Design a protein around this ligand. Structure first.
Ligand code: F4L
Ligand code: F4L
Ligand code: F4L
Lengths: 256, 257, 257
């Protein structure tokens, strides 16, 4: 199971069932949960927790220090939940003390080749980061979001649930939930209707969201004006509450 | 010896005469490597995969992996690489899918530069150049002598025409006709790869006919059907113009404008 | 032992006494590493290459490979890296070509982040930051304190001026004068790196002269020659404005407007 050409540190803690391929390093204070397959040529540094039925592909560096000059050797964490797929050459950095000292990844995420998850970034669940997506630092990606290949996300930006970025997008402002964004700089186009139909959203929920988009984007309203209009549609439909909450929590403005 | 003893060579792998495998490389089950092919160190080959003769594959490359685009994979899907190809550091090439071609296909004399991605069921021809971090989604066809500048992104099902050129950071969402130069995200047609025509020894008459051929398609408000009819005569006279017309004829999903 | 036994040290390699090399790293023929330098695991160092003192080179990096550039034909060319440089994961640095100066040169105190590329015959000075996946094509000069944000692409022969800044995903096809801030694909001149100047402690008087110097080049309908002639006075008075004027004077591909 543990290939004899792998270096497993004494401090490491590997649940039974765990596979580690040859020439992989499981470093000091790295936990791995049952069912997790670590590939060949993987560098795991801690303090790091990895959950269950994860797959980490060759040439990935999971749990290294941020090179960001605002990090001076403090003991910070990286947590990864269950049923994640981390592909070839992904880099995931641990937190910094300045924020919450944790980089966090939930469950059922698909992180494609050469993606970068910067320090203190929070990834939720069932997210897809397509090839070479780069999250700068303190980036929050809520559940089911999809970032197309070579999507760049500025420090501290929030990526809403069910949001979609087009290929080569450069995001400098929050993307509300359900919103599709394209280009450099990134601009709002539409709602992720396919994402809603994926979730078996009621036809009434999809209509409430279709309208909610117009309130925010295509009706000349300010953000405070728009939050007021959405407050009843949000009280009625939980799906709209997600959209409304993503705009409310966007203190640094929304992607328009 | 040619096979470094720190490399893992599966019993089912077939190595031909003059093959080199550098240290800590994996030659997985049902990988076939042809005559004089050099596998660097830290290379992962996964099968079923057929690599031809006098190829060079650099460190940190993953050649023959499964697409992550499916969660439950198919077997057997194949990867076929021809002769005299250069695959540089950190390149990812995915095998085909059971739904579509069941094969990713690369021809001969191609240069695939560092960290380029070739997605499931894509077809590369001959004498192509994929510059650093070019990424092909899935079922992309790159025809002979196409050059994609670094960080070019190509959407699923798109055709890259022969002798075409993409500018750095191009995001191609529709077919690029033969010879056409495209730039930006989203990609826009600018001109033709006259530089590339001269290097292939194209007659100046064939180049003048291709310049007029660009105007017919792009600059004179014609339907594609009208463009094809208007090009028919030039196309009969010059094989070079026929390559252009044929690339436009085969675009079901529209051309890059 | 500071040399991991699983590492490959070519007999012809010249390592200072306290050099570290992690497991499964290759220090090839005619590679020299100065005192304090830590090489991580899974690094390929190829020569002829000189690395100075107190450098750090992370896993999956390929430092000193031949350029795939077709004009190179296996000639004996060099890479030279100075002291106190950080080279992050999967960085690729190519040696030079005989057509230029047969050398790729990196100075001191540079931070080169994950999957950056430094093409043949590139010259990087001191205190530069190349953020993730920055790609320099070839013969690119990046002068002191320049910051290039992630996925910045730089065309062959482009000069990146001192204390210059490029935004996320910039595509630089023309020279970036010193202090100038550029964004987007293609790169556009926005203003000057005042944030960067103020922080490094530039004089109020100097910043004010650079602001007017910016106006002169960009905002007064002057051609480059008329701009340089107008700059003559302030260039004469202020060094910072001389660096600016000089970076314009040495621009071979034009300047980013
Ligand atoms: C550049 C590259 C890497 C070759 O392709 C992509 O970036 N992504 C595709 C879509 C895609 C791939 N896997 C997925 C899984 C779930 C949902 C969508 C996808 C795409 O083409 N995105 C897009 N379309 N228009 N603009 N950007
Ligand atoms: C692609 C990726 C990694 C997700 O994002 C970045 O490139 N981040 C940079 C951060 C940065 C700014 N200055 C620095 C100095 C040293 C080190 C890092 C920086 C940025 O966000 N660049 C920018 N700013 N405005 N537009 N693009
Ligand atoms: C992103 C990176 C790696 C830093 O540079 C490039 O993409 N380089 C290409 C090189 C090139 C130009 N002409 C060629 C012919 C044959 C073969 C390679 C080329 C380019 O620069 N492409 C372009 N030019 N203008 N916009 N994009």
């Amino acid at each position: 199971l543990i290939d004899p050409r792998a270096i497993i540190d004494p401090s490491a803690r590997l649940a039974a069932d765990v596979q580690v391929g040859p020439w992989s390093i499981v470093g000091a204070e790295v936990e791995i949960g049952e069912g997790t397959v670590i590939g060949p040529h993987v560098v795991l540094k801690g303090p790091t927790k990895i959950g269950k039925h994860n797959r980490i592909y060759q040439f990935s560096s999971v749990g290294e220090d941020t090179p960001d000059l605002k990090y001076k050797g403090e003991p910070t964490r990286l947590v990864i939940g269950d049923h994640n797929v981390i592909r070839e050459g992904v880099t995931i950095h641990r937190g910094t003390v300045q924020d919450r000292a944790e980089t966090t990844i939930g469950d059922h995420n698909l992180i494609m080749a050469y993606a970068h998850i910067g320090h203190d970034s929070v990834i939720g669940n069932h997210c897809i980061l397509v090839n070479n997506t780069a999250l700068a630092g303190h980036v929050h990606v809520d559940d089911w979001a999809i970032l197309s290949g070579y999507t760049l996300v500025h420090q501290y930006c929030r990526i809403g649930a069910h949001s979609f970025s087009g290929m080569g997008s450069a995001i400098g402002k929050d993307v509300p939930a359900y919103v599709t964004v394209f280009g450099n700089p990134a601009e709002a186009r539409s709602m992720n209707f396919e994402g809603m139909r994926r979730r078996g959203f009621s036809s009434e929920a999809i209509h409430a969201l279709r309208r909610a988009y117009k309130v925010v984007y295509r009706q000349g309203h300010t953000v405070e004006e728009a939050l007021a209009e959405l407050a009843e549609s949000a009280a009625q439909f939980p799906e709209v509450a997600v959209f409304r909450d993503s705009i409310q929590s966007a203190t640094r403005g929304i992607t328009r």
